């Protein structure tokens, strides 16, 4: 059903499935301690997960998978998906991370949690990278969908859907008036950033099950998604 969709239809379907931007708890009480900061982020991420799971079901070709495959992909990609969203939100705020409209953080506030600042820098670098090449929203939703389907596929139909989003990405660039060379160059630039998003996810994940070893209580769901990475 996803294969029969057109590129303009693909974009519209993805843009319409976009999860909302949630707000942090309105304490706010500043500066933070490492416990309070991790609390706000954990609480936020847990609420984002519920919206992500529903955003995923509305990704073309995702409901066509077995319930096993849907679970595996989400378990593999959830932090990547959270991060690219964070990065996307933070584009218009150079040097800042926009976790929530009422929660904007700079690098220095990253030092609150025992680095953290290392991941902050990687996230800030990714956001600036997007800002530099003027990443469009239609491009963003395609990238986030690619992350969902690709990140756990090496662990047919999925690669078929993946090719479609590639077709969609090219379409957007041909629309913007880019030359054939500029299209595959920009496409390459976008996809290579995914390797860095993966890296940030792995580094972030590694610290998440080292926080569990009891700074902030994690939700049962956030623990499940965390256990899926051993």
């Amino acid at each position: 059903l996803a294969l029969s969709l057109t590129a303009d239809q693909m974009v519209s379907a993805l843009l319409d499935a976009e999860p909302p931007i949630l707000y942090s708890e309105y304490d706010p009480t500043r500066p933070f301690s490492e416990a309070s900061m991790m609390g706000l982020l954990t609480n936020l991420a847990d609420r984002e997960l519920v919206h992500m799971i529903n955003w995923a079901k509305r990704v073309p070709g995702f409901v066509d998978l077995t319930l096993h495959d849907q679970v595996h992909l989400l378990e593999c990609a959830w932090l990547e998906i959270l991060m690219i969203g964070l990065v996307w939100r933070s584009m218009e705020h150079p040097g800042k991370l926009l976790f929530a409209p009422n929660l904007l953080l700079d690098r220095n506030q990253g030092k609150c949690v025992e680095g953290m600042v290392e991941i902050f820098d990687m996230l800030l670098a990714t956001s600036s990278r997007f800002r530099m090449m003027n990443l469009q929203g239609e491009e963003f939703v395609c990238l986030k969908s690619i992350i969902l389907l690709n990140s756990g596929v090496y662990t047919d139909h999925i690669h078929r859907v993946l090719d479609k989003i590639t077709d969609t990405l090219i379409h957007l660039m041909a629309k913007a008036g880019l030359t054939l060379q500029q299209q595959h160059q920009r496409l390459a630039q976008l996809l290579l950033i995914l390797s860095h998003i993966r890296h940030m996810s792995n580094k972030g994940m590694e610290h998440l099950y080292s926080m569990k070893c009891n700074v902030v209580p994690l939700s049962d769901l956030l623990l499940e998604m965390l256990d899926a990475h051993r």
């Binding site: 519920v50 799971i53 529903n54 079901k57 319930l67 849907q70 679970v71 989400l74 378990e75 049962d220 769901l221 499940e224 998604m225």
Partner: peptide, 9 residues
């Protein structure tokens, strides 16, 4: 798991 429920819901 919890993830199963939220997917079917």
């Amino acid at each position: 798991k919890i993830l199963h429920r939220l997917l079917q819901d």
